[PDB]
């Protein structure tokens, strides 16, 4: 019995460990969010299938690493779901062919937010998985340890919903004018979704965001967001109603808004946070 990765790294008879570099495409799913499918990344075979049956489990202690170590979730092992980190060994999967077959492991994360996320830098550790191999031949009991690394920068969703983008830049027409903000949200299953803006405001109503351009700033203007003409101030929850699998636009538009005093030439910039909640 031995195993190898998609890039050819191998662990031989008797076990050992290897590093696995994977391209991530996290996605929200109903009740659990996909972190990484490894059934395309790790493969194993039985070396004497006419004579020996090999048994393979995911051993307890397998867990997320890096920034993901705080999170709990599930592991999908040959189609069935088990808690993750594994606190007890999974059932046994038979290996009975010389042909390399996938080790059918997919890691999921339990939602803890509405539409939150957590950044994964390329090259960081996301999981350590312990493959345990036994047989019906002798008392071999071998450990194949897979250190899973992110091969790319991604954001793993931590909520029931996901956004069209995490960083959006828009450019206003030269003053005066407005521009739509392209920003949508969907949820794996229907959720009662809201959101609220956060940022530095120049007015009492907390509805105009300060011009924080640092090079040659204009004066007397800020930025103000509208939802089809309704002013959206900071720290006020806006309801989106029920959001499901069809993307919903937040409906937002950026405007210049007077803040007081002579409006002078220069640059305008405002950074505005969006945070989703359940209602």
């Amino acid at each position: 019995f031995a195993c190898k990765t998609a890039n050819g790294t191998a662990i031989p008879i008797g076990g050992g460990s290897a590093n696995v570099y994977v391209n991530l495409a996290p996605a929200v799913n109903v009740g659990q969010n996909l972190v990484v499918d490894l059934s395309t990344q790790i493969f194993c075979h039985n070396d004497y299938p006419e004579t020996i049956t090999d048994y393979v489990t995911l051993q307890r202690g397998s867990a997320y690493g890096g920034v993901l170590s705080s999170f709990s979730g599930t592991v999908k092992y040959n189609g069935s779901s088990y808690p993750f980190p594994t606190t007890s060994e999974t059932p046994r999967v038979v290996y009975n062919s010389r042909t390399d077959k996938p080790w059918p492991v997919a890691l999921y994360l339990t939602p803890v937010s509405s539409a939150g996320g957590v950044a994964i830098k390329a090259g960081s550790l996301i999981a350590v998985l312990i493959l345990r191999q036994t047989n019906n031949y002798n008392s071999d009991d071998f450990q194949f340890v897979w250190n899973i690394y992110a091969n790319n920068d991604v954001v793993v969703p931590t909520g029931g919903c996901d956004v069209s983008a995490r960083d959006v830049t828009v450019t206003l027409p030269d003053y005066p004018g407005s521009v739509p903000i392209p920003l949508t949200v969907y949820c794996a299953k229907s959720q009662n979704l809201g959101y609220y803006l956060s940022g530095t405001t120049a007015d009492a109503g907390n509805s105009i965001f300060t011009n924080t351009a640092s090079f040659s700033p204009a004066q007397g203007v800020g930025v103000q967001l509208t939802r089809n003409g309704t002013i959206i101030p900071a720290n006020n929850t806006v309801s989106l109603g029920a959001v499901g699998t069809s993307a919903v636009s937040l409906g937002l538009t950026a405007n210049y808004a007077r803040t007081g005093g002579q409006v002078t030439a220069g640059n305008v910039q405002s950074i505005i946070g969006v945070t989703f909640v359940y209602q």
Binding site: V170, D174, V179, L252, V263, T264, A265, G266, Q269, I272
Partner: peptide, 14 residues
């Protein structure tokens, strides 16, 4: 914040 919006604009002399 779950999302960060950056709004850029300009006031031109006229």
């Amino acid at each position: 914040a779950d999302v960060t919006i950056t709004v850029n604009g300009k006031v031109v002399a006229k």
